Structures are given as structure tokens and as C-alpha cells.
Amino acid sequence: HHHHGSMLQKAIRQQQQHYLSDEFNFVTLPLVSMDLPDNTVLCTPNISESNTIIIVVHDTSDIWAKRNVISGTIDLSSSVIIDNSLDFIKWGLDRKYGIIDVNIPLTLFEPDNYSGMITSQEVLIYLWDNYIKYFPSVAKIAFIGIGDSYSGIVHLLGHRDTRAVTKTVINFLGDKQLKPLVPLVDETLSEWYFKNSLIFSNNSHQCWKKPRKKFGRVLRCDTDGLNNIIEERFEEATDFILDS
Amino acid sequence: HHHHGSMLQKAIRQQQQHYLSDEFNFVTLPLVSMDLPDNTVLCTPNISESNTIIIVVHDTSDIWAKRNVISGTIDLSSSVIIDNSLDFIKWGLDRKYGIIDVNIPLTLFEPDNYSGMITSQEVLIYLWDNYIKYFPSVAKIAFIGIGDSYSGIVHLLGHRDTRAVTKTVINFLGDKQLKPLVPLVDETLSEWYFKNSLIFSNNSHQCWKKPRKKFGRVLRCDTDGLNNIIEERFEEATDFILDS
């Protein structure tokens, strides 16, 4: 039986690309000279001329579907995309913010997602060095990282001076492993990162079973599951964003 | 939550198209002037110059995947295509037969698959009237219909004189409804159809809980599930094929 997991990852991002184009006319941010698909990064038009930007980073979205229990096969008509960034996108558009949506493919068929995290680091560095750094009108960025993909955000904070425009970082972690920030340029960054971040994790997390300050203010949600903790704490998150 | 079922149907057929091209260099049979995708019908090269053709008709393949039980989401790395026609394709290639593979999209989001069956009827009529009818070297066709898609086959038998080249029809039914053949051109066809068909259905089927001759020799397998009854009776099927 032939695996179908990679095809699915691309099918998911492509339907997302479709909705975001039809509904809010997003577009692609050519991440040329990297062997990643075009719709990896998507963004509001005239993003270059935007004041405030929300940048949402995530791994491929989950698919929920019922499953004929004994055949074990997936009910195609019940299949839906659980898009954890869509509500942040709609929230920011409704305040005329610039939106950047980054999609990082999961590393399937491997003990964990180390490699996906590395890709996340590389894409956010490309984004910052070739774009954004050359955005004239950008003032105030908020970063939202869903799942493992958040590694790319923390990496960028530590490997680029950034505090000129970065006002908030949010991480909806779930059951994933906490990402440390190890500053390279400035040690103040440790204190800044703790006072300007929210790291939302599953109630059932390994931690709390003592998180150190390099991790940046970890909070224990009352539920589990990325979708659940985002629903649970979307207001606390957006609240925290606006006060910066 | 946005449905994802249609995208999936196209993603499945497209990975199939990939394997069949890389592994046996299949190609597309332009079904022009119909608003169906290119990879609907796929076939061995030089099909026009083939003596014996196996024609395998099926609905979109199932996807099996484990599912994180409480989040309810699908394990992408465990996801696989359950391709019920692949073993017939490999069986026929290993005897140098011509292969034609027809894919009919399921009608998702509707009480049943009436519409898909109608599409199946239309594609096999297009195939027979614009192609095949004009194949010089074709002698001996066997039809294999998986699931509801078999309706297109029965329809063609009754709406076109066909017995010049059709030697066997096989239907791996499962739990679907039996397709009657109502001859239009010739009444002998009822007797021919019963003596030249095998209709394999699930042990748990509605029938046997008395099938009439218009249905063409229904057999009760010992298991349930298309994949299971094909595994169970692949030899009986191929056996029945060769004796014609």
C-alpha cells in the first residue's frame, strides 16, 4: 500500500491557498532560491506598504474526518481542514493589519520533526533578510507560531536584531517541546523575551508533572489540543498583542 | 471548518497517475469535450495496437490512515492508498495485455452515489464510441468494475452491441446495490450476461438476508470490504477471465 502523506500535505496547503485568494486575495511571496513550494508563504497584497503586520507561522494543518471503524478508511465527505491560523488572519484583516502566513511541511516518516523545525528557521531567516528588512512602512510586528514551527521564530529573534519592530511573540505549543531562546547578540533579549511572549501549552504537558526563563513565560491551558487551546485563549492572545 | 473531500479525490488520482507513469509509463486518454480531469482514464501505451485489453473501472480509491483517537485527526504518515485495481493492472501487464484504467469521482455530500454512476455510464460510452470502436487490433476485452462504477459497464453492455469483443465482465460489488442489465438491443444478452459474469458481494449483503437473472450470477464472498473480497477472490476472477 502506497503512502499518501506527502501528497496530502500539498493538497492541504493548496486548498488553503485557494480560500485565502478567493476570500481575501492573498498572494505568494516568492521564496526563490529555495526548493520549497510557492504557496509556502502567503500574504496580504501591498504587504510592503503595511504599518502593522501579523505574521502567522504553522506546520501543515490537521485533517479531521470520521472513519468507518472496521474498514478503517477515512470518510471523504466528512473530511475537513482544521486551520488554526484562519481566525488570527480574519482578526487582523478586520483591523486592516498586514498578514503574512507561513506554512512549514511536517517531516513525516521520522521519529520527530527536527527537520521541519530547521526548515522553519530557514524560511523565517529568508523572509527577514530578503523581505521585511526592506519594508519601509512596517512598524509593529506580532509573531504567532503554532506547534513546532515556532522554532523558526525563536531562532530569528536570537540571530537577528529585531526588537525595533517586533512587539509580541506568541506560541500555541500544545504538547510539543518548549523552544529555548539563546540570545546571541544581546543578553537583554532574555528579559525582553520573557516579558513579551506567551507560550500556551496543553494542560497535560511534560512540564508541570519549573520552566526556565529562556523559554519565555509558559502558561498551562485548561484543555489539550492546538485547536482547543487556541479557542480557549484566542482572546488572551489578541489582548496581549494589542497592548504593544 | 472547510471541507477537504473534493481536493482529496483529486490528490488521490494524481498520485496514482504518478505511480502508473513512473512504473509502467501509462498515459492519459483525452476524454475531450467532457468536463472531467485528464487523468480520469489512463492506459498502456499503444493501447490502440493491443490484442487483449483489461479495462478496470473504479471509483476514487479509499485512504486508510490511523487516527489519533481523541483529537480525531488523521495520522498523515500512516496514510496510504488502498488501490483495488493495481493488482489487476500488474496481473495483465505480466501477460502483455493492454490496460485501461477508468477513475470515477465519488459524489460526496449527497445521500448516495447516483450521480457518480451516471458519470460512469457516460465515460464508458465515450470510451466505446470514440475509442475502442475504432481499435483495429483489439480482440478480447475483459471488464472489471469495482463498486458503484460498475454501472457504467452494465450500461454499455445494454446500450451497445459489444459481444464481438467482450469476453468477461467482473464486478467486485461489496455492499453496494446490484446493477441490473436490462437489454435493449438483444434478449440473448440476458443469458449471455449471466454466463459471462461474476458479481462478488460482501458476506453481509442485503441480498441473502434470491437474486434475479438480470443481475448476472451473484456470489456471496466469505468476507466484507472491497479490498478483502478482491484479495479473497482475485484468483477465481482471473481464472474466470482467462477461460474466455
Numbering used by the authors:
A (entry chain A), B (entry chain A): 450 to 658, 664 to 698
Question: Can I see the authors' text?
Answer:
Hda1 is a typical class II histone deacetylase from Saccharomyces cerevisiae. Two related proteins Hda2 and Hda3 are essential for the activity of Hda1 both in vivo and in vitro. Together, they form the yeast Hda1 HDAC complex, which specifically deacetylates H2B and H3, with Hda1 homo-dimer as the catalytic subunit and Hda2-Hda3 hetero-dimer as the non-catalytic subunit. Hda1 contains an N-terminal catalytic HDAC domain and a C-terminal ARB2 domain. The ARB2 domain is defined by sequence homology to the Arb2 protein, which is a subunit of the yeast Argonaute complex and is essential for histone H3 Lys9 (H3-K9) methylation, heterochromatin assembly, and siRNA generation.
To gain insight into the role of the C-terminal non-catalytic domain of Hda1 functioning in the deacetylation process, we determined the crystal structure of ARB2 domain of Hda1. The structure was solved by the SAD method using the Se anomalous signal. The final model has been refined to 2.7 Å resolution and the details of the data collection and refinement statistics are summarized in Table 1. There is one ARB2 domain molecule observed in the crystal asymmetric unit. The ARB2 domain adopts an α/β sandwich architecture with an arm protruding outside. The core structure comprises an eight-stranded β-sheet (β1↑-β2↓-β4↑-β3↑-β5↑-β6↑-β7↑-β8↑), flanked by three α-helices on the proximal side (α1, α3 and α8) and four α-helices on the distal side (α4, α5, α6 and α7). The protruded arm region spans residues 509–532, and contains a short α-helix (α2). Further examination of symmetry-related molecules indicates that two ARB2 domain molecules form a homodimer. As shown in Fig. 2A,B two symmetry-related ARB2 domain molecules come together to form an inverse “V” shape via the respective arm region. Residues Ile512, Ile523 and Leu525 located in the protruded arm region of each molecules form a hydrophobic core, which dominates the domain-domain interaction. The ITC results show that all of these mutants could weaken the interaction between the ARB2 domain and histones, suggesting that the inverse “V” shape groove is indeed involved in interacting with histones and the residues His604, His608 and Arg609 are indispensable for binding to H3-H4.
